[PDB]
Amino acid sequence: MLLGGFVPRRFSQFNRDPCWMFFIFSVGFWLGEYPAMMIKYNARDLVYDPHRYVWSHHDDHH
Amino acid sequence: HDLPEGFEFMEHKVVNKDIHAPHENLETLRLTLTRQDEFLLREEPVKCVTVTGTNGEYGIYPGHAYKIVQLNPSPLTVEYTDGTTKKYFVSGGFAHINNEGSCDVNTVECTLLDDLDLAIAEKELAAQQAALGSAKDDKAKSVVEIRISVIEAVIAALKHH
Amino acid sequence: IALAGVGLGIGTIFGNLLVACARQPNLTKMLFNYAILGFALTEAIGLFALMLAFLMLFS
Amino acid sequence: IALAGVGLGIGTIFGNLLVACARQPNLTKMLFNYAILGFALTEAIGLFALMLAFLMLFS
Amino acid sequence: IALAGVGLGIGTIFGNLLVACARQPNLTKMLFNYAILGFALTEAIGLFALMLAFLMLFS
């Protein structure tokens, strides 16, 4: 119902409560998984599967 | 020297209802009919009142939304919860409808439809029609047209019933 | 699709009927008859569209 | 589909008729006659479309 | 698509009903009877549209 509870005023206060500490850790995970995906899936050495045209989900579900 | 305001003498103030208030189902309407500063009905409970305004006819029943109506020369009907109808004829004025369950019809002249006569209207209509052709100027023509319209409305009301 | 213009037309008649009744309820018995008359005409138009919908559907 | 507008147009006439009657119940006869006039005029277009439909149906 | 007209027509009836009652709350019963009469008459046209759909989908 969103009635009350501890509300940090800014980022620096998220360490003033264990629940908000876990929340900021989770937010860090959420936002930091994106740069990791950028680096991993846009890497120079990444190569498409040579057999990618052998089979695809499009033919399977069709 | 605190001049008592003339309205203060009249303690029967108007009962206006706040918007947020809970609804009430009303079975009667408090009608207040007035002629030339003389009331014929004092907050009389009635079932409904029919009034002919400028745009058209209006049938006011209890709980009708707040409104202001500019009446025109025409009959006015009042039907009580008992099942009795009383018909007047008005020449003009205003009707105030309140959502609280009140209706104040203040007319310049309100007379019983019975008091009116048919032959008198007919002869007056003929005289006005004759005088319309001999109207001095545009203003006279408009005045005669106003008089003719009133007479026609009276005749129509009489012929209706 | 012609029925779309018929069913909508009927609703318009009844919509104005409610306003007319809310203005002069004592005339409801008269207005209702006229409202029925309008429905008897718009519905008749729908029959013509229905007739074609049936003739082609069975020919 | 041409009948969609025709049927809707009739509803408009018989919609305003109720409103007009309540305002001036003394003029029901004159208003009713005009409403019938409008209905006939709209029906004329309806038959024009109906004629085309039948001609293209049995041709 | 015929349901588009029926759906709109029903909403128009209720749209007039709401204002009709606000004008005369004392008649929230008489007006209501005519409104659902309208819904049934308009829904009747929808049955034909659905019937044709079911008479062609299963054919």
Added chain:
Amino acid sequence: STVAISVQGLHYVGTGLAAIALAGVGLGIGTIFGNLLVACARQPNLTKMLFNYAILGFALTEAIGLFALMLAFLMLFS
């Protein structure tokens, strides 16, 4: 390759479309007579002049209808 095709039945489709325009005309007639009644109730004294103007509105709107109808018949027989 060059291919020229002449479909005879297409003229039916064009004719039906021209008939649809009649709906915009037929509905327009109702609008004029829908407001004529209100005007008569508002100002009964002008029951005559308003009627003449309404007829004029019908004429102009009807004329548009015939213009569309001419295309409908031309393609029906050609």
Added chain:
Amino acid sequence: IALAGVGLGIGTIFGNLLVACARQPNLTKMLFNYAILGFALTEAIGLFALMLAFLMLFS
């Protein structure tokens, strides 16, 4: 496409609801209930269109 005549019909009801509340605000409850009734009936028609839409989509 039948949903187009449904969404508009719903908008018409609520559009009239606000005016009716503005005219007879104390009567909001009865107006609100009748609006829900009208909304329910209009949605029922739209779903019949969805029933056909899903029947054909999976056929």
Added chain:
Amino acid sequence: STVAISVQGLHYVGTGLAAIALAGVGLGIGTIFGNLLVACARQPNLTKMLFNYAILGFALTEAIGLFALMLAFLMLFS
């Protein structure tokens, strides 16, 4: 392979579509006259100035209909 096709009867279809453009034109004209009657009823003394404006609106609306009609006939003769 390259294939060029020339379908003849299509011009009937396009012409019919242009005819539908007159539906709004017919409706629009009816709307003007409908409002004219109410305006005359409200202000009966202005039976000429309102009439002049109504004619102006019809002329402009008719021009739009004529624009569409030119395409309707032109395609029918192409």
Added chain:
Amino acid sequence: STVAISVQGLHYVGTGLAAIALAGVGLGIGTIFGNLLVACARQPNLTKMLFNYAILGFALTEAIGLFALMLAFLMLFS
């Protein structure tokens, strides 16, 4: 197999569709004048001022119809 086809007559269909846009434009213009008559009968002292705005609205509303008409010419002449 790969097949490339080039139909000539389709341009008629697209042209007719563009004309339908005029239906709204024609109706929209009628709406402006319809309100103009009501406005004039409600405050005739501003008739000249109201007329100027109505012309402005007509010019803006008309401009849209030209865009559709331009597309019709582009496809009709291509």
Added chain:
Amino acid sequence: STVAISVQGLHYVGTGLAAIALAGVGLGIGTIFGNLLVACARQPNLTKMLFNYAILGFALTEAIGLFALMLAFLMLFS
């Protein structure tokens, strides 16, 4: 059997359909100005303020037509 077909003239149909969206824009503008004329006759003192808002609606209403107009060029020229 696998068959791939490439019809060249279909972009005309898409362009015409996109142009049809302009009817709503034109009608919307007409409604805006129609209400403007009525509103001005009611509160003439605030005519200038009403005019600015009416133009704002036109700016926010014509923009939608451009998106539909944009799609026409993206398909007409491709």
Added chain:
Amino acid sequence: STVAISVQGLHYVGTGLAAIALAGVGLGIGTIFGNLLVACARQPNLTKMLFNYAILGFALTEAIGLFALMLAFLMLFS
């Protein structure tokens, strides 16, 4: 016999049909602004609040246009 066909020009038709959805959005915006002008004249003391509510409604309508436009670009490219 089994025949599989792939028409490369059918996405134009789908794109055009999606673009037609903007006709409702444009008219909806016109209705919002038409009422805004009427309301402003009625109660000019609340112009700011009415203006904010009109913007809110405009944003909601624009979002629907984006939904319709979303299906247009997707089909146009995909």
Added chain:
Amino acid sequence: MFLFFFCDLFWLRLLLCMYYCVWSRLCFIVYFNCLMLIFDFLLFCLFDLYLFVGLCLFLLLWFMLFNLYSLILYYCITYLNLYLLFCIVFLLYIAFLFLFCFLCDFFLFNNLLVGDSFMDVFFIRFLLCFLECFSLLCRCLSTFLRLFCNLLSSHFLLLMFFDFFYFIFVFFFYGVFCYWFILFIFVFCFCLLFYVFLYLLDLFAAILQLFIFCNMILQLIMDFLLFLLFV
């Protein structure tokens, strides 16, 4: 065929056990109208008009535990099947209808014959009666269909938008370092705004649809209730 699976509420069941081992007041109810059926005093009903309160509360709780938490990514609405919702609505609606019918009071159906004696019985009143008796079952069907399809459509839209957001965020963030960074920033702000708007809309609609799911049943009940006046 017998399939063994489990609902997606085990964690929520654990939380309910942990937090509700002790009593707590409830003051906010999604559908409060099931507790106040009579608004005019001195009116009382001999029918068990408060029987629906427990089912209403349980249904609200269950559907809220499912739908509201379904916004969280990868959360599954285990009951999301058209015919399963049909079964639920059938149970509730038909149970109340058979409660009214088992009363063996035929006069209760008099209102089905719409209208007054002044209208043709066979060609007007009777047709409308048929249509209304059809409308009852249509109301049941409409309730279940609306509940199913609102959820399905909202979640389809959310999945599509999230896919687009992931695609652009992952494969086009490098534009921040390029000369066209402004376009990417505009697109990213637009996507964030749309994300927030979609989440708010879904949160509000999930609760509104339950209001309406319970309101349809309460309306069915009210259509056959008669109130006596105390004297």
Added chain:
Amino acid sequence: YNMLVFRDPKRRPQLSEEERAKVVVNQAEWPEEFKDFDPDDPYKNSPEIIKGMSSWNLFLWGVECAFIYQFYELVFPKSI
């Protein structure tokens, strides 16, 4: 103030202006945590749950966990 949709509750005043003006404020009696109290930042002086553990440290911890989750297979791949 707000943090996303979470709004900080605010206590309604109970004392009238006349009574309020007669109140003597003595911050010496106040706890060290709440001195120079500011409604817009009541937790500025609130002690940390873990000494030396900043919010940014936890955010970076989460980022590192995400990086591990995404990159562990890249260094220690396993067969199907």
